[PDB]
């Protein structure tokens, strides 16, 4: 059923039909272009007039171009053949290696599973990072969030969990990149050929990739995250494997819908977002779940705008996350890397019936001596360090060794540092922190714990500093 274009303002194109009206959330093909331009229906306006949003640019559009209809939403190709390929929002391959040849096509708009299709079991997934496994443990099949501002390490910490977790994992893996720099989608395609995860010669790859970056029109940065978790829904449902899912960034799903909003005819809410902010967020975040047919681990990076966690876009994602890892610029400007805030990160399995009673009284023993270190800094600013008593000159020196011991040299940050990549196991992280608290290392300076692995290297680094006096 053909239709004409009657208005173009920005990225919002109005299309008047005559005899057959397509429903909301469909695909319309603009005839007359050399490229493929797909329009997605968003509203009805009466007298057979819809109002659409454009997936590509709108330059060179004229009033009267005949527009076809599909009868179905954006059906991307899906299957086992899409592994090791980069694809577009509408399913075209942009790796320039040929057509994706598969048998299953699947729409990106689908429902959420019901209440009696949820799973209830909890586990612990070990990573190897000392701050994460001690104070805020992650979980298999659980949604994980990476907060923090701009330029603190959200892309590197999400590059670390592809390094550790994704090669030791059995099943497949999906990376959706939404609204980030087009350079950094090339340092992933060239750090996954030389590690053999993407293979360009046969059929043994384990990673798919979906990319819509920050050069796209704002109608195309808000349907890419729905295209990421459509491929990752095929593996969980039509197959049975354990899937991972990495999403960076996800603040650019909310922001890209706050730009097409005022031309669709909506009054703005608080500080500038759309009125339907917490409904379409909660419509995407209810498909990333662990059901009774599979399990989806999911790590997500969440940009916090100008270091304010009370902004309405990051402060409504908290209801959808089990483990939050709040990064901070006040730690990163000390040199403590990864800058994870210990007094602001939580988990749902910090529970002495799940992690055992020995891990539990160590975690709260670390936060209690760090929070009591905070209230002591208010005295040193007026009194000084030396005028304190000898009893709280010790709880400072125990706290400063706990701050520095949490910082671990990462593997993918070798070109920044030159240091080597360490991976401390779970049983050693607890035993390292019992001995600083009990007082078994009061004879070492603070520098012996900076950027080390296990506690064994904390004394080997202590003697090597001594001899150069």
């Amino acid at each position: 059923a053909t239709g004409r274009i009657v208005a173009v303002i920005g990225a919002v194109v109005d299309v008047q039909f005559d005899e057959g009206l397509p429903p909301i959330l469909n695909a319309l093909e603009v005839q007359g272009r050399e490229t493929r331009l797909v329009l997605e229906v968003a509203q009805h306006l009466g007298e057979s007039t819809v109002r659409t949003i454009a997936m590509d640019g709108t330059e060179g559009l004229v009033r009267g171009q005949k527009v076809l209809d599909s009868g179905a939403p954006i059906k991307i190709p899906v299957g086992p053949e899409t592994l090791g390929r980069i694809m577009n929002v509408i399913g075209e391959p942009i790796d320039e290696r040929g057509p994706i040849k598969t048998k299953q096509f699947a729409a990106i708009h689908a429902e959420a599973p019901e209440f009696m299709e949820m799973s209830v079991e909890q586990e612990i997934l070990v990573t190897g990072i000392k701050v994460v496994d001690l104070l805020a443990p992650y979980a298999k099949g659980g949604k994980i969030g990476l907060f923090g501002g701009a330029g603190v390490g959200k892309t590197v910490l999400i590059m670390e969990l592809i390094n550790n977790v994704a090669k030791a994992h059995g099943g497949y893996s999906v990376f959706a990149g939404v609204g980030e720099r087009t350079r950094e989608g090339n340092d992933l395609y060239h750090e996954m050929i030389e590690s053999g995860v993407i293979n360009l010669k046969d059929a043994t790859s384990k990673v798919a990739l979906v990319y819509g970056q920050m050069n796209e029109p704002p109608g195309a940065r808000a349907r890419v995250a729905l295209t990421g978790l459509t491929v990752a829904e095929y593996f969980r449902d039509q197959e049975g494997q354990d899937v991972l899912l990495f999403i960076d960034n996800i603040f650019r799903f909310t922001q890209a819908g706050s730009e097409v909003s005022a031309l669709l005819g909506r009054i703005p809410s608080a500080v500038g977002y759309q009125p339907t902010l917490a409904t379409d967020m909660g419509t995407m975040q209810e498909r990333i779940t662990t059901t009774k047919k599979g399990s989806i681990t999911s790590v997500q990076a969440i940009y916090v705008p100008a270091d304010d966690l009370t902004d309405p876009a990051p402060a409504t994602t908290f209801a959808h996350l089990d483990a939050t890892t709040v990064l901070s610029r006040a730690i990163a400007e000390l040199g403590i890397y990864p800058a994870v805030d210990p007094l602001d990160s939580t988990s749902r399995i910090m529970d002495p019936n799940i992690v055992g009673s020995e891990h539990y009284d160590v975690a709260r023993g670390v936060q209690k001596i760090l929070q009591d270190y905070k209230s002591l800094q208010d005295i040193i600013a007026i009194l000084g360090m030396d005028e304190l008593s000898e009893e709280d000159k010790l709880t400072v020196s125990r706290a400063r060794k706990i701050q520095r011991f949490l910082s671990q040299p990462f593997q993918v940050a070798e070109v920044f540092t030159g240091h080597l990549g360490k991976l401390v196991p779970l049983k050693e992280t607890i035993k390292g922190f019992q001995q600083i608290l009990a007082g078994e290392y009061d004879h070492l300076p603070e520098q012996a714990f900076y950027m080390v692995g296990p506690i064994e290297e904390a004394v080997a680094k202590a003697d090597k500093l001594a001899e150069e006096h």
Partner: protein
């Protein structure tokens, strides 16, 4: 202000988060004091006798 739940009240750790004069005077006093304790704990760490026999 503070003599009600409504008004602004100050918490623990608010001199360092401000980052002013007293917030900088506190960071350079925790470092110039614990620099000398990396001297006395490292000079007495060379007094291991087994290392001297190796020397």
């Amino acid at each position: 202000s503070s003599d009600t739940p409504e008004g602004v009240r100050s918490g623990a750790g608010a001199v360092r988060d401000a980052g002013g004069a007293f917030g900088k005077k506190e960071q350079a006093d925790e470092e110039r004091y614990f620099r000398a304790r990396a001297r006395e704990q490292l000079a007495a760490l060379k007094k291991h006798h087994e290392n001297e026999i190796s020397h």
